């Protein structure tokens, strides 16, 4: 070792040459996955190629709680609120997740509205052609039925907007930094304050 260089820490002391993974098959993998997707689309025709509907869920942890993404499946509470029996939802293209809990009204209401939109946009063929049942669609709707290729219900964020508002005296007399400092102090000293209150 010589000169002023960063201290090296290369992890190459084992038989690493026997565990090298190359990517010469990357185009082949892409082609194989595309072929599988095409075969699946042909198989499930006329069902949408994007797959079953998924719920809207929040991101985990403080880093992503402002983000909205797709969850595994709709909760039992959401299905009950939307009037869709849980045993029927999977058969009509709705994913079901019996594990997800509903802690707030906003998420439950959002997913219920999503399910209602899907129901409004859903067309169901009868099990037997000559027999029409409660959940089946009319012949006119069935005739104009096609396979949807892309995502039929994109999960998108409401883009930010900067509006002009009046600055009132109440806002001009608010000490944000002082509020933050006092809240931090209260959080730090809650235990001591409770102990003193209990003692006295």
């Amino acid at each position: 070792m010589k000169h002023n260089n960063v201290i090296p820490n290369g992890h190459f002391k084992k038989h690493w040459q026997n565990y090298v993974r190359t990517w010469f098959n990357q185009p082949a993998r892409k082609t194989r996955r595309r072929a599988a997707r095409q075969q699946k689309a042909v198989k499930i025709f006329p069902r949408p190629t994007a797959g079953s509907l998924r719920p809207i869920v929040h991101g985990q942890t403080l880093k992503y709680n402002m983000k909205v993404r797709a969850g595994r499946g709709f909760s039992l509470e959401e299905l009950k609120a939307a009037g869709i029996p849980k045993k029927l939802a999977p058969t009509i293209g709705i994913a079901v997740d019996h594990r997800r809990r509903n802690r707030s009204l906003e998420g439950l209401q959002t997913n219920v509205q999503r399910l209602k939109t899907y129901k409004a946009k859903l067309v169901i063929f009868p099990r037997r052609a000559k027999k029409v049942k409660a959940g089946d669609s009319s012949a006119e709707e069935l005739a104009t039925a096609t396979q949807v290729q892309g995502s039929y219900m994109p999960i998108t964020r409401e883009q930010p907007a900067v509006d002009l508002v009046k600055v009132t005296d109440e806002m001009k007399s608010f000490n944000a930094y002082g509020k933050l400092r006092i809240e931090r102090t209260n959080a730090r000293h809650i235990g001591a304050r409770l102990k003193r209150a209990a003692e006295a």
């Binding site: 070792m1 930010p160 002009l164 001009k172 608010f174 000490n175 944000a176």
Partner: protein
């Protein structure tokens, strides 16, 4: 590019540029960072002060997400406002633009630099520094706390 390698220029010069006396042997000073305290001590001390020893407390299973806190300076707040909103704010002095820095991925607002002259700005953020709040108040704006 082999044809540009200097060993090609050294073909026919015996030592290949590594000297007749010293030569190019396998590991004359040990492997890797060997001898950091004994025969490579001068190099470590002069170029890598602080290398040896330990300081501070440990933190088992430390997750960086709970420490996430992007910051933006007040001198960059105006750049977030779209051009049409900037024009509207310039035209009308009875209202101020309302910038939610959280929608742009910022948690805390710091107080480096200055704002546009004679422009009131309403800023909403999770946290703010005392200087940033003072500058916003002086500009005629206000600060709103969110989460």
């Amino acid at each position: 590019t082999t044809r540009f390698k200097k060993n090609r220029k050294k073909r026919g010069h015996v030592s290949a540029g590594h000297g007749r006396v010293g030569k190019h042997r396998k590991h004359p000073g040990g492997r890797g960072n060997a001898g950091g305290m004994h025969h490579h001590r001068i190099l470590f001390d002069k170029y890598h002060p602080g290398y040896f020893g330990k300081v501070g407390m440990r933190y088992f299973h430390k997750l960086r997400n709970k420490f996430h806190c992007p910051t933006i300076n007040i001198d960059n707040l105006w750049s977030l406002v779209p051009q049409e909103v900037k024009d509207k704010a310039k035209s009308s002095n009875a209202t101020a633009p309302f910038i939610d820095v959280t929608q742009y991925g910022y948690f805390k607002v710091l107080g480096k630099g200055v704002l546009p002259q004679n422009q009131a700005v309403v800023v909403k953020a999770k946290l703010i520094s005392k200087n940033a709040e003072k500058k916003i108040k002086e500009a005629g704006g206000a600060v709103v706390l969110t989460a």
